[PDB]
Design a protein around this nucleic acid. Sequence first.
RNA 1: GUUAUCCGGAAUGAUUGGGCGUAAAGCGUCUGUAGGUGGCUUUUUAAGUCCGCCGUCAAAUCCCAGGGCUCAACCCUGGACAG
RNA 2: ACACCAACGGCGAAAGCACUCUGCUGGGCCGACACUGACACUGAGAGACGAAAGCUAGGGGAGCGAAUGGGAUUAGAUACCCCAGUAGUCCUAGCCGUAAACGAUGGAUACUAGGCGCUGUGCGUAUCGACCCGUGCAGUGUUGUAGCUAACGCGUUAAGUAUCCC
RNA 3: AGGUGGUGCAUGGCUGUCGUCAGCUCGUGCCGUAAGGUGUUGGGUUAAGUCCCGCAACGAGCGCAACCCUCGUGUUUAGUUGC
Lengths: 227, 213, 171, 154
Amino acid sequence: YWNINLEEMMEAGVHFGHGTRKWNPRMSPYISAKCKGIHIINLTRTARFLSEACDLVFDASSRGKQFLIVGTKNKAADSVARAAIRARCHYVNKKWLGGMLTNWSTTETRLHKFRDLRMEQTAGRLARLPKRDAAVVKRQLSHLQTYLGGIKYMTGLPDIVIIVDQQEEYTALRECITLGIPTICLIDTNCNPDLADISIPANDDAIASIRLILTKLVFAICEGRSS
Amino acid sequence: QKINPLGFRLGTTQSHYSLWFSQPKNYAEGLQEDQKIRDCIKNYVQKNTKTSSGVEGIARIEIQKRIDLIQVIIHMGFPKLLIENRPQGVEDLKINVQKELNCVNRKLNIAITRIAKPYGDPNILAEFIAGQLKSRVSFRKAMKKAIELTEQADTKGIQIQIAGRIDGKEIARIEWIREGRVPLQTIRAKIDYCAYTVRTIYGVLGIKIWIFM
Amino acid sequence: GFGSKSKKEKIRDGFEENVVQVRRVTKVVKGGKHMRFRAIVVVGDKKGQVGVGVGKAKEVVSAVQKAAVDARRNIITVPMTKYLTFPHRNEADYGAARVMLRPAAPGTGVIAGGAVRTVLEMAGVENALGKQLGSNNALNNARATIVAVQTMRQFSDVARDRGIPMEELWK
Amino acid sequence: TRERQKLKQLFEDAYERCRNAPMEGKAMADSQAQLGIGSVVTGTVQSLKPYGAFIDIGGINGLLHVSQISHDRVSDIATVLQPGDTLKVMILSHDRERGRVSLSTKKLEPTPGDMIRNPKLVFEKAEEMAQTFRQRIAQAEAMARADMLRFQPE
RNA sequence: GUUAUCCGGAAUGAUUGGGCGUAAAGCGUCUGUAGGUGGCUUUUUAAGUCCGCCGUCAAAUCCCAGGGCUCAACCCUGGACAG
RNA sequence: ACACCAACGGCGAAAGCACUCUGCUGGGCCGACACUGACACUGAGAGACGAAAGCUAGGGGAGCGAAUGGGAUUAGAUACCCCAGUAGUCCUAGCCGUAAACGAUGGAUACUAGGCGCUGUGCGUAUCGACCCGUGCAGUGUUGUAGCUAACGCGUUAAGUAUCCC
RNA sequence: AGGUGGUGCAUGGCUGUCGUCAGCUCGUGCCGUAAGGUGUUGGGUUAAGUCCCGCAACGAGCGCAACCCUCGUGUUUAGUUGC
């Protein structure tokens, strides 16, 4: 069914939008009101597009796939990881590389090296070599730990990618549009509904609104695994 | 320009061939003897297999002198092609090699061994690209053919340089193709190379093959 | 590094390939003046499935097949309703190459300029006639036909779009 | 086969993106304190400046803004103001430059409401959602291992 | 086969079918005569416009269909869209 | 000739226009229906104005300064440098009618995201008064969506979409 | 047969030089219609494209360095023709 009451969003930071002279006017038949230097998002079409969002997420996992979620902002960094360890999904820790989806051959070989270095890190032969080799392995393992630590459990492309709002990850988003991979994401008051093909326009100033829509879709995916 | 690898690595990982230890005037005369042995073996197999069909590919001719007896090892890749089937190939080798060493009538054992994988040995592979390139086949078909022909037979890295006067030209070129690591500077790395000169009809070609193993 | 790429080349019965031009394009450096090969490969089955692709590399054949791998990720399908011809006439420019395509009777082999004719004889259409208005170029020409045959509509989807039930069509 | 599957996926999504768009519907010491981004506690104002109020919040640095403070109808005080006061603040923008947190009262916020069909079914699944939420939140331990045998992706 | 003449290609004189920031090209700017184009509603005549009918645009040519030369070229009989 | 004011500022059709004051006089913008009722746009040929240098006539002539003259640099220097310095520069009355007279973009109307500005007025808020916020228009500028473009870029002041006229 | 006859602008091999200067490219991806760029640019730091951070780039090859010889200090072992 996947409902959310209108009052649960209407109380929290959902209509609590963004700045009133920064609006990108492809929301001009969309945005409801404006108050005190902050936009007011129309919540009817918001919840309907979230109804559609959970229909098209739960249906896509009902076919049986693996989903992906991007996490980069450092305002919603660990909340995605909480929204991805229980939900079985593979996730971006803090920061993104341009090429992790489209140039995935070299990323795949980079996972050969990252898999071998985790195999050496577990095996206890790390203390054999002195501080030089241990320093190099800790540095490259730190950088791959920054990116590839959260997506070790993926081979191939996902079906639906859900991203940190719009700003920091136009890179990952445009790799998704080049690959054709459908994405269902969050929109601010001043961004594009036509980048992805369905997305969920709600402000992400609130951590609890991010925890709201992401927690909603986490139970959508886990009930997708419920089979 | 660049130093050649078999010269550069002689202290370690590459051993000499003419392995006999002597004194100065006797050093010059032993070098006489070595050069005439390599002449008789090379000219021998070139004649008695020029009448035969294919290429032989004799890579190394090691000459050793323990006692007054000379071990001669011949490292070709295709050793069944040589003999006249009882052993008479190596017997007639031993005849014509005995023809030019009998100052002191000391015995010599001509042996013959197999190359482990003949495509991976740059003198033999250089002879192959020499043979096909001496036939009217382009640089690209023959040279890529040598590359995939090599990588099916287990070689880490390879560099092929073919020198001037390719198929029809009056301006010399150099054309080199590399795959994998070929570190020419790393002294431990054990690169074996060959430098064969193809004597064509419209000129002279130069093939220089580096193999990193 | 398994060797010889026998299974991996995918013998290309599904897509037949041809070049349409291989121009040697060159850049100068401090050392001198060195060239690479830009080849334009148009891939496509005769089912109605084509696409261009450029490539450049210092070898000829790696530039051709590299342009092919760029090309076989760039495919449109041809709206070609009738007995292997076109629904209606079309014109669409790209850059400064304008291309007029016009459907033909079935007793007419494809008549166009070399790039347009190359992407149509690979497109499996048999009955067209396309004049080229503008450039002597081959890449923007062919890519202008590709844009000139994306935007082309059948009668069934225009009948579906307008909502009109059906008439005014012989077949 | 993989390419065809990808194409089919894309079609599904574009149709899923075809059905319902139609119809439907001072500061240096504070900077030193911010070694680490984590931990909210009750927002502490430790500087005040028109444009907003700057606010230590359990180890995290926040920014309340005027429009996001309580409206003041009282006789006397500087609007925005806050001096050393300790105020319950909700987590808003979380400013990206220097990694701050923004804080916002947000107002009365009365919004017009449109009636939605199936609320009978729509309350029931909201209840189900609340039950799933109560089952959620898990503080300690890390999944992982499940043992298995690792294999090359190729 | 070469040459000469003409058309094409040539959208390279452009109605179909081009251009004018920088490639050839916007007058130095402005007033205004002739002339060109022109807001909305209602009514009238029909000059333009459209439809019917009628007359004519010779015959030969071109197009269709038959027929004749052993076929074709060519000749002949009938018919007509355009305009 | 008019420093600071001088501003990516205001006005003019363009060229141009800045020390202040006065007189005569053009043009713009905004509001109310106060009036007429398409009187509109463009404009061949035509007419006017048109920086600077130039010329006729008469004044005036401090500075600057083609030509010229001397000194220097230089192989040489008719040139850059320096010292004198005539026409000219200014004004009256004319003639000349050209300039990178440039926004390198003829004019007019209608329509097509925004952000940040400035100038002029208009309404409402706020006070009852200067502010200050939004705005209705007109004009001027800067980034920029769509679209166009060979590209650079232009983008409500289009080089966009269309119509008209030269 | 012989050719130290010609052509080093028909060549191979070899070598010098810029210079032991720190670069030169490639694969995949992205940008541009395209030649091309991006990496290799920027902030530091090195003898070094050496290394670290940010970055539509991610990696890799040759380059640099090390492994090679010699001179440096000490240990173990062997003492003649040497002490």
